[PDB]
Amino acid sequence: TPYIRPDMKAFLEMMAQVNGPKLSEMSLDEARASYLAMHNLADRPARALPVIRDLSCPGPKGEIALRLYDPRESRAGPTPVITFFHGGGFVIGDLDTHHALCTEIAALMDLPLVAVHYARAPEAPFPAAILDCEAATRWIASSPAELGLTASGIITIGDSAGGNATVVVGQLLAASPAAVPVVLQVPIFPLVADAVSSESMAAFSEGYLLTAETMAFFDAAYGADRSDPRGFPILGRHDNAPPTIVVTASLDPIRDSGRAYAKALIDAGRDCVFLEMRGVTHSFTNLRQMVPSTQADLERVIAAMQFMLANPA
Amino acid sequence: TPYIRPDMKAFLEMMAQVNGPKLSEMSLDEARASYLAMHNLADRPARALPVIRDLSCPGPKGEIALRLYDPRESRGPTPVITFFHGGGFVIGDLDTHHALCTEIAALMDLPLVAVHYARAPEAPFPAAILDCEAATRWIASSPAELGLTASGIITIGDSAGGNATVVVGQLLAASPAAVPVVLQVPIFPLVADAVSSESMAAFSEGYLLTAETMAFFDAAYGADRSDPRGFPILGRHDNAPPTIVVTASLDPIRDSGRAYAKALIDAGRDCVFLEMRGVTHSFTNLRQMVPSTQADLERVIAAMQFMLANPA
């Protein structure tokens, strides 16, 4: 029996009684609404902030909707800017599903944070999400007047599929720089390497929130090519990776995908903080109300981010 | 050409101008004195601390000499740093790493005990390890002679001392001391056998630690290649303490430390991996003549403070 925290186990037992439908059996609107409901149920409430502002930026296919978060009433001087990419398999999730987590990261970092509402599958398959995430990051990095920030660097961060986007965007910008560098990247339980035949996939593919059926659903909707580094960034370039914090969860079927990325960075001689949260599942960053110990996990990631930013190579 | 910092390159060029014996060609006393002279030349001055005190503790073959460092005049419960010096288990002592020890203690604001473990060839493998283990267990017992109430042990050491760091952590994981190891900091350590590594081929000459020096250490210490006390990559990793692994990019045994960080990830254990770019083995003791290495050390210090303040 894999180690599991008491509060994590109680939450899994509750979710097992719900016995909700598979994502493949829902309409896309129902799946997307169900995900918002799950985070509203399980996560802490959003913090009140002086700056929570909707805006847009030009993208390859039209405007990309963004949301700016800042705990400060004003921030006119040069600053790193956090660029956040939500999870959801590239199919579900939006600015509202991860809203509470965004207010939390912004408040605890005391930094501005921009969340990206990238184009989702299946309506817009791979590579649409990546190209939106890249375009938004390059735009933020240009210090546009409508954001009101003077960016000195970019901090990329994202959970799950958003952790995939984090690494892909970092590789695209390492190859072809934006106006400022990525000064820190934080992929959180990310999909970096293909998970299909991993040991963690065999061990945790049922009963730990993220299921094999869900992974297959996301896989079919997104349609990423297995040999394309923009789909599976373990295949991308690592010897110029930005400073990195890789976060995994010990009970996660795609745990070994994030582990593989940390090892690839080490193989390339690149600094990496590896944090594996013990006894919790995939999605733990959004379970902070009903699994209270996950707030402490998030705060450890925050402290790692502050350490890395204050102590660059 | 591998990336090298300008101040690092200038130091290597100066060392290449020296025309003298290699370590193996000297008497053991001369080799040990030459190592002290190298660190006295290259490193920053030792800091003034109110407590710098020599003492000893019982060990498996007699007394083990120790040195206590504390930036505080008076010290309740506290972590205690236990430091193991480098030198291939052949050279090095309490004086070769004295300046570095005062720096770590001052910057951490913690007490630090350095260990004068038994050295090869007079005492072959595993004598150094067994002395390091005995000293750490004694420190962890909060003995009256030290005057500390230990709440946990922070292990740390460079090169062979980083090997000792990991081995001591494995021996205490298997049979705990009075308090746990709360953090281990192996710095450019030997963890996996380096003999056929790519870094050994790429950096075996021209970068301070040479193939000749590694061969000299190996023929004196004679670690058993099948013994996790010689090569702790072979040991148990799933219960490893919180870890910061530090490597140097121009180091022939760089891949040995990289391998340990990868082993911890494979075991699901938190690990801060820092590879200092453009510097060699021994960079922690080059802070005067290669001034950029002081900033490298301060990054390690900040990593230690982060891990201690934010335990799993």
Side-chain angles (χ1 to χ4, degrees):
Chain A
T1 308
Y3 167 71
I4 180 166
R5 294 179 199 170
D7 58 356
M8 187 76 248
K9 179 167 190 199
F11 182 74
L12 294 183
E13 283 168 352
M14 174 191 94
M15 293 299 295
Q17 185 44 220
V18 176
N19 204 50
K22 294 174 168 54
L23 300 174
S24 67
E25 310 165 340
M26 299 180 235
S27 81
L28 288 166
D29 285 1
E30 288 166 346
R32 288 162 177 160
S34 188
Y35 192 43
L36 172 66
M38 181 172 119
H39 282 190
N40 287 347
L41 177 90
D43 209 11
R44 293 262 258 270
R47 303 187 176 221
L49 304 172
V51 175
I52 300 177
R53 178 156 73 81
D54 295 309
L55 70 154
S56 75
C57 72
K61 303 317 259 166
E63 292 290 301
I64 299 165
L66 314 169
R67 190 169 293 159
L68 168 67
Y69 299 79
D70 197 331
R72 291 191 199 180
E73 284 201 1
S74 71
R75 197 186 298 261
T79 179
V81 179
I82 300 168
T83 304
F84 178 92
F85 314 116
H86 68 84
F90 295 116
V91 175
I92 63 184
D94 49 51
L95 301 173
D96 295 326
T97 58
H98 288 61
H99 180 72
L101 176 61
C102 283
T103 71
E104 195 75 14
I105 295 166
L108 294 183
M109 290 300 299
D110 188 17
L111 285 177
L113 181 155
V114 182
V116 182
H117 191 13
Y118 52 80
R120 295 170 299 182
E123 297 101 318
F126 169 87
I130 289 319
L131 299 173
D132 271 6
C133 290
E134 179 197 15
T137 307
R138 289 182 186 283
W139 183 82
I140 292 157
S142 75
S143 300
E146 42 257 81
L147 252 195
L149 297 162
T150 302
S152 62
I154 294 293
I155 299 154
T156 52
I157 182 160
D159 61 305
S160 200
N164 175 279
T166 292
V167 180
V168 172
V169 167
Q171 287 174 353
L172 291 163
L173 268 57
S176 184
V180 297
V182 175
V183 297
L184 177 66
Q185 69 175 358
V186 191
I188 297 169
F189 32 87
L191 199 290
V192 181
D194 192 351
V196 284
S197 310
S198 60
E199 300 167 21
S200 57
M201 182 65 64
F204 307 116
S205 54
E206 301 298 334
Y208 295 96
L209 293 186
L210 174 56
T211 63
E213 286 80 14
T214 290
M215 284 297 300
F217 168 79
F218 291 152
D219 211 338
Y222 193 53
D225 294 282
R226 263 43 190 179
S227 59
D228 191 336
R230 292 180 306 171
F232 299 89
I234 198 72
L235 306 174
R237 181 170 198 144
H238 308 310
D239 66 18
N240 57 2
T244 301
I245 301 159
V246 172
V247 185
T248 58
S250 72
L251 304 170
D252 187 343
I254 70 162
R255 174 196 78 188
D256 291 354
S257 187
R259 291 184 176 183
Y261 186 52
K263 287 165 65 186
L265 294 175
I266 292 165
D267 280 343
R270 304 304 288 188
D271 297 337
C272 184
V273 177
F274 173 74
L275 301 174
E276 181 154 304
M277 305 307 180
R278 294 185 210 114
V280 297
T281 58
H282 202 81
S283 299
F284 73 80
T285 50
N286 301 84
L287 310 176
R288 280 119 84 281
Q289 181 69 34
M290 292 201 71
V291 187
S293 68
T294 58
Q295 175 75 21
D297 300 322
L298 177 58
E299 288 170 3
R300 295 181 64 219
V301 180
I302 295 292
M305 294 168 62
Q306 294 164 329
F307 148 67
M308 289 292 282
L309 291 171
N311 297 278
Chain B
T1 310
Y3 168 69
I4 182 165
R5 296 178 195 172
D7 56 358
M8 185 75 250
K9 184 176 185 188
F11 181 71
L12 293 180
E13 286 168 349
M14 186 255 276
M15 291 283 113
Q17 293 182 40
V18 176
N19 190 1
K22 303 170 193 222
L23 287 173
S24 67
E25 314 175 49
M26 311 173 182
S27 78
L28 288 174
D29 283 354
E30 283 163 356
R32 288 165 178 156
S34 299
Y35 190 43
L36 176 64
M38 189 189 98
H39 282 187
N40 282 344
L41 180 87
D43 209 8
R44 283 190 173 192
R47 285 179 185 239
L49 303 176
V51 176
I52 302 179
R53 180 158 69 79
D54 291 313
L55 71 155
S56 74
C57 73
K61 295 292 192 23
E63 293 285 301
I64 302 164
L66 308 168
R67 191 170 291 164
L68 166 65
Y69 300 75
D70 198 330
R72 281 196 206 166
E73 57 296 314
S74 323
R75 214 175 279 263
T78 177
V80 181
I81 302 166
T82 303
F83 177 91
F84 316 115
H85 68 82
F89 296 118
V90 176
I91 63 184
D93 50 50
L94 299 177
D95 296 321
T96 58
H97 288 63
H98 179 74
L100 177 61
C101 284
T102 69
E103 192 81 9
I104 298 168
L107 295 182
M108 292 298 299
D109 187 21
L110 287 173
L112 179 156
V113 182
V115 181
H116 192 12
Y117 53 78
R119 294 172 301 184
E122 297 100 320
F125 171 82
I129 287 324
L130 301 177
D131 270 6
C132 289
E133 180 194 13
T136 306
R137 289 186 184 282
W138 183 83
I139 294 154
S141 74
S142 301
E145 292 84 351
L146 257 193
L148 302 166
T149 305
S151 63
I153 297 291
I154 298 160
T155 52
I156 184 166
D158 61 303
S159 188
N163 175 275
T165 291
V166 180
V167 173
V168 167
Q170 287 178 3
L171 292 165
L172 268 57
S175 176
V179 297
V181 178
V182 295
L183 177 65
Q184 63 172 4
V185 190
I187 300 170
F188 31 86
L190 186 73
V191 177
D193 196 354
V195 158
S196 320
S197 66
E198 177 52 60
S199 55
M200 181 67 48
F203 308 113
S204 70
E205 303 293 337
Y207 297 99
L208 275 200
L209 175 62
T210 64
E212 282 77 17
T213 294
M214 285 296 292
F216 166 69
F217 293 154
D218 196 42
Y221 189 60
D224 176 357
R225 258 66 190 175
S226 283
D227 191 327
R229 297 172 308 164
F231 300 89
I233 198 72
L234 307 172
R236 180 172 173 191
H237 306 307
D238 70 276
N239 59 357
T243 304
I244 299 155
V245 172
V246 182
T247 57
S249 72
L250 300 170
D251 188 346
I253 69 166
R254 172 193 83 181
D255 289 359
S256 188
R258 290 178 175 187
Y260 186 49
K262 291 166 65 186
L264 292 174
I265 291 158
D266 279 344
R269 306 300 287 187
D270 302 331
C271 182
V272 175
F273 173 73
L274 302 181
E275 180 155 306
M276 305 306 181
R277 301 200 290 262
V279 294
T280 60
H281 201 83
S282 297
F283 72 80
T284 48
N285 302 81
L286 310 181
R287 286 121 82 277
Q288 181 72 24
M289 296 303 287
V290 186
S292 64
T293 60
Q294 175 72 22
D296 301 322
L297 176 63
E298 290 172 5
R299 294 183 66 217
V300 180
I301 293 290
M304 293 165 64
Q305 292 164 336
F306 148 68
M307 292 289 282
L308 291 165
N310 299 274

